[PDB]
Amino acid sequence: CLRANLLVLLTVVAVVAGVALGLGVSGAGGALALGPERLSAFVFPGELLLRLLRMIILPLVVCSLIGGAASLDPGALGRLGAWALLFFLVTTLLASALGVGLALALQPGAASAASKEVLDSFLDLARNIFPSNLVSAAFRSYSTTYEERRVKVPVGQEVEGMNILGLVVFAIVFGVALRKLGPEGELLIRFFNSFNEATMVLVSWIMWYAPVGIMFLVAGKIVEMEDVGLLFARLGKYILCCLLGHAIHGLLVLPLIYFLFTRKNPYRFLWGIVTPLATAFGTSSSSATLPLMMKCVEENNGVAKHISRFILPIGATVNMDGAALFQCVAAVFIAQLSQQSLDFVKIITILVTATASSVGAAGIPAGGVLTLAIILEAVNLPVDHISLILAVDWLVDRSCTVLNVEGDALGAGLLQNYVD
Ligand SMILES: NC(=O)CC[C@H](N)C(=O)O
Ligand code: NA
Ligand code: NA
Ligand code: NA
């Protein structure tokens, strides 16, 4: 009955009704009929849902990772983290290879009628791994700009955007330190567990408002971006390539890996995590849907508390299969647009750069375009075409987000069988 699956049905209905309402508003005038004053009010509920989800990201992530790191032996935690990192890297590489292969086979750039250096980007990623200030890292991330002193000198500053990766690393290290302390750190372990439980209560409350926010978010997203026909006619092949790659990875490849390692049915796991998947689609942010990911993984599935609260926060930052797939597809599409020959070395470096820079993605909406330019510059491809990718990034990115969070969930389930 619709008693325990009421949230799943409500969220699916919310997505469908948001698409329908956005299409109806667009057909009735769209932005011109509404205007900015009415558009802001129309899309406000989705922004409210995003704010509610982002408000609890820092305490939930910090407390969950501290508890998970302090709930395991340092050797066992290290082995679990190594297996998680291997799974994340393998899945990201598979997604990148699938995206490159699909783009090469289908050739979305057949119809030709339509920053930051790589080293500095990786140095910024390393700096964000080890934050210089925890309070600053709670709302700021390091980023490198350039000064034409006309040799370009890279100078860095803390820009807006939560440094989730640095908080993750610090929380893991602090949990390990608490475990090594033992009796002295037991009080802190209890404190962080209680804080995480309270944040779980807040997540359970926000989960009921989640359908309305998702509906209004998708409605506003498809209302603001008008001329859907032109978008799907000019970049239709690229959109189809990205969506097909995401669907293949999330419904064929990742479930195949889950079934091969865990003889259980992966689609039951997917049904259990449907609600955070649709939340990821609506919000286009892995971080925002991460609390719902942990909730559904812990309750709807049989994943242990420590495994989930240690793997999902890490995967929400490191494991991004959709981002890597989209970046590889976009790189091959732009190379085909410029009639650039993609040899084996170029394909290999595209795959490597996408896999390495998917970790550096912030997990925020429209976060893949900041990485696509870096990947293009790594292969010396033209960068002026990214504007085309910006035309439909409101949709593809959303799909990417789904894949991203999905992988995380499956990894947790997989690692559950590594513990049992
Ligand atoms: N295109 C992308 O995948 C960027 C990251 C995505 N917005 C996420 O949160 O997972
Ligand atoms: Na991966
Ligand atoms: Na993720
Ligand atoms: Na990332």
CB-based contacts of 240, cutoff 8 Å, min separation 6: 106, 108
Please report whether residue 121 resides in a domain. Answer: yes
Please report whether residue 236 resides in a domain. Answer: yes
- In angstroms, the Cα distances linking 25 to 33, 303, 390, 395 are 9, 42, 23, 18
Residue of minimum CA distance from atom 3 in ligand 1: 323
| Cβ of 355 less than 6 Å from ligand 1 | no
Instruction: Calculate Rg over the CA atoms of the chain.
Output: 21
The CA dihedral of 63, 92, 275, 209, to the nearest 10 degrees, is 60
Ligand 4 centroid from CA 362, angstroms: 5
Rounded distance, CA 370 to CA 317, Å? Answer: 16
Mutate to test the pocket of ligand 1, among 238, 320, 358 (most ligand atoms within 8 A of CB): 320
Please report whether residue 109 resides in a domain. Answer: yes
Task: For residue 404, say whether it is annotated as part of any ligand binding site.
Answer: yes
Evaluate whether 56 touches 289 at the Cβ level (below 8 Å): no
Tally of residues, the chain? 420
| Cβ of 285 less than 6 Å from ligand 1 | yes
Mutate to test the pocket of ligand 1, among 50, 364, 402, 403 (most ligand atoms within 8 A of CB): 364
| Cβ of 360 less than 6 Å from ligand 1 | no
Please report whether residue 90 resides in a domain. Answer: yes
Rounded distance, CA 354 to CA 277, Å? Answer: 23
| Cβ of 329 less than 6 Å from ligand 1 | no
Mutate to test the pocket of ligand 1, among 401, 403, 405, 406 (most ligand atoms within 8 A of CB): 401
Helix axes 344-358, 321-337, angle to 10 degrees: 140
| Cβ of 404 less than 6 Å from ligand 1 | yes
Nearest to 337 by CA among 107, 42, 64, 124: 107
Q: What is the 3-state secondary structure (H, E, C) of the chain?
A: CCCCCHHHHHHHHHHHHHHHHHHHHHHCCCHHHHCHHHHHHHHHHHHHHHHHHHHCHHHHHHHHHHHHHHCCCHHHHHHHHHHHHHHHHHHHHHHHHHHHHHHHHHCCCCCCCCCCCHHHHHHHHHHHHCCCCHHHHCCEEEEEEEEECCCEEEEEEEEECCCHHHHHHHHHHHHHHHHHHCHHHHHHHHHHHHHHHHHHHHHHHHHHHHHHHHHHHHHHHHHHCCCHHHHHHHCHHHHHHHHHHHHHHHHHHHHHHHHHHCCCCHHHHHHHCHHHHHHHHHHCCHHHHHHHHHHHHHHCCCCCHHHHHHHHHHHCCCCCHHHHHHHHHHHHHHHHHCCCCCCHHHHHHHHHHHHHHHCCCCCCCCCCHHHHHHHHHHCCCCCCCHHHHHHHHHHHHHHHHHHHHHHHHHHHHHHHHHHC
- Its domain, for residue 199, covers 6-419
Evaluate whether 355 touches 97 at the Cβ level (below 8 Å): no
| Cβ of 361 less than 6 Å from ligand 1 | yes
| Cβ of 282 less than 6 Å from ligand 1 | no
Please report whether residue 1 resides in a domain. Answer: no
- Tell me the HSE value of 31 on the side-chain side, using a 13 A CA sphere: 9
Rounded distance, CA 286 to CA 320, Å? Answer: 9
Please report whether residue 93 resides in a domain. Answer: yes
Please report whether residue 192 resides in a domain. Answer: yes
Task: For residue 275, say whether it is annotated as part of any ligand binding site.
Answer: no
Rounded distance, CA 188 to CA 191, Å? Answer: 5
Tell me, what CATH number does 68's domain have? Answer: 1.10.3860.10
- Take residue 322 and report the two structure tokens written for it: 């959709």
Q: Give the method of determination.
A: cryo-EM
Buried b (16+ CB within 10 A) or exposed e, 133-162: eeeebbebbbbbeeeeeeeeeeeeebeebb
- In angstroms, the Cα distances linking 316 to 58, 98, 131, 289 are 13, 21, 18, 9
Rounded distance, CA 251 to CA 73, Å? Answer: 35
Domain count, the chain: 1
Evaluate whether 323 touches 361 at the Cβ level (below 8 Å): yes
Task: For residue 73, say whether it is annotated as part of any ligand binding site.
Answer: no
Measured in degrees and rounded to the nearest 5, phi and psi for residue 146 equal: -130, 145
| Atom number of ligand 1 nearest to Cα 367 | 4
